[PDB]
Structures are given as C-alpha cells and as structure tokens.
Amino acid sequence: ALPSASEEQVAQDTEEVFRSYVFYRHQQEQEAEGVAAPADPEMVTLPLQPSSTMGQVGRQLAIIGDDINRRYDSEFQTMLQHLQPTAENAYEYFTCIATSLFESGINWGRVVALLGFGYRLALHVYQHGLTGFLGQVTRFVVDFMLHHCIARWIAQRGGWVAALNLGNG
Amino acid sequence: MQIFVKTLTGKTITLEVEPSDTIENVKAKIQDKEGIPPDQQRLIFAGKQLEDGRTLSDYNIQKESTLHLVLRLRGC
Numbered sequence: 001a002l003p004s005a006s007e008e009q010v011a012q013d014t015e016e017v018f019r020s021y022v023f024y025r026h027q028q029e030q031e032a033e034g035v036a037a038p039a040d041p042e043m044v045t046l047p048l049q050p051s052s053t054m055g056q057v058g059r060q061l062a063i064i065g066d067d068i069n070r071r072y073d074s075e076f077q078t079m080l081q082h083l084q085p086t087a088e089n090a091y092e093y094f095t096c097i098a099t100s101l102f103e104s105g106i107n108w109g110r111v112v113a114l115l116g117f118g119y120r121l122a123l124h125v126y127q128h129g130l131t132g133f134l135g136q137v138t139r140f141v142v143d144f145m146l147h148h149c150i151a152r153w154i155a156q157r158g159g160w161v162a163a164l165n166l167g168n169g
Numbered sequence: 170m171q172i173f174v175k176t177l178t179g180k181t182i183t184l185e186v187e188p189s190d191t192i193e194n195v196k197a198k199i200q201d202k203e204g205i206p207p208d209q210q211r212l213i214f215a216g217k218q219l220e221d222g223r224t225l226s227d228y229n230i231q232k233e234s235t236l237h238l239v240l241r242l243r244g245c
Contacts, residue, residue: 074216096245104178
C-alpha cells in the first residue's frame with residue numbers, strides 16, 4: 001500500500017489484523033490440541049480476506065509472538081476461570097488487565113499479548129450461552145484503542161505496515 | 170539465596186530469600202523495596218500461578234531462578 005496513515009484508516013486495519021491473527025494462530029493450534037477449538041470447518045468458520053496485504057501482517061505477528069505466547073498461556077486461563085465475568089461488566093474487567101499491563105509502558109510485545117488474551121475471553125461467553133458476542137468485542141476494543149490514544153502511537157510507528165520492517169519482516 | 174525477578178518493562182531486580190520463605194513474605198519484600206501492593210502481584214513460574222499458602226521448596230525453585238511478574242490492578 002502507500003506510506004503514511006491516519007487514525008481513520010488505523011481503526012480499519014486494526015480490526016482486520018486482529019482476527020486474521022487469532023485465526024492463523026488457532027488454525028495451527030487445532031493440529032496439536034483442540035482447546036477452545038472453532039465451530040468445526042463449516043459456514044460458521046471465520047471468512048477473512050487474505051487477498052489484502054494485511055493478510056501477511058497477521059502471519060508475521062503470529063511468528064514473533066509464538067513461543068512468548070505459550071510461555072505464560074497456561075496461567076492465563078487458570079486465573080480467567082477464577083474471574084467469571086458478565087456481559088454487564090465484561091469491559092470493566094478487560095479494561096483492568098490491559099491498563100494493568102501497559103501501565104509500565106507500550107511496546108510491540110504488549111500489543112500482541114493483548115490480542116492473544118483477547119480471544120478465549122470472548123469465546124468463553126459464546127459457549128457459556130451468550131450467542132452474539134463477537135460483534136460486541138469488536139465494537140468494544142476499537143473504542144478503547146481510539147480512547148487510549150493507541151491508534152495515534154501506531155500511526156507514529158509507521159502504521160501496521162511497519163510490521164514487515166521488523167525481525168522476520 | 171539470591172533470585173532475579175524480571176518485569177514487563179525490561180527492568181530486573183535482585184532479591185535475597187530462602188527456600189523456606191513463604192510466597193507472602195517475598196511479596197512483602199518487593200513492596201518494601203519497590204512499593205507494589207501485594208494485591209496487584211501475579212508471580213509466574215513454569216507457567217504455574219504459585220499459591221500464597223505454599224513455600225518456595227514446594228515448587229522446587231533453586232537459586233539464581235527467574236520469575237515473571239504480571240499485574241491485575243486493585244482499583245478494578
């Protein structure tokens with residue numbers, strides 16, 4: 001695409017890179033285990049658009065955060081069960097862990113870790129019985145990212161197109 | 170013995186404790202030299218959330234060991 005980017009186009013590439021990443025991450029985890037597996041390969045699958053350059057952004061971010069993700073993952077669900085949040089206070093708990101994580105500062109490792117622990121959380125309600133939460137989590141994070149001035153920083157870092165200019169690029 | 174705790178800011182702080190020390194004591198030492206309330210501490214070792222009713226020998230932590238530190242805040 002073209003260089004430079006505003007906060008108006010960052011909210012669109014943020015939502016597209018948020019699912020394209022959790023998808024390629026659960027797709028490979030399905031071969032090893034089936035924990036929090038998807039609804040089987042059918043119409044209820046996740047139809048992403050890999051025809052765009054953002055398709056390669058999720059694949060890369062899913063590689064630099066592969067081992068660091070499993071390192072502290074068995075403890076994320078263990079404490080998540082002791083939480084037992086609700087649809088009325090779902091943003092009151094998630095906004096707490098995040099603000100408690102970036103409280104020290106902001107880095108590429110703190111963004112991938114956020115999405116990593118931003119999946120099972122939503123799916124945890126889907127199974128519970130609250131069908132129709134995926135649209136809620138989307139129209140919730142994008143608002144937190146634009147309210148916490150996260151979109152700007154990403155714009156100063158070169159937008160999401162700066163991912164190709166990282167380690168494995 | 171001496172242990173090394175790693176934070177999410179890239180800062181590592183040393184700590185002098187003993188295998189018979191309880192997890193509640195090590196947390197008090199961190200707030201005494203750092204000021205971080207024990208209610209907002211999520212130690213992590215081997216992908217296991219150590220409990221507050223067990224000692225360090227319970228997990229088999231030797232000397233020169235490293236433990237990650239997360240955070241759950243107390244306001245929310």
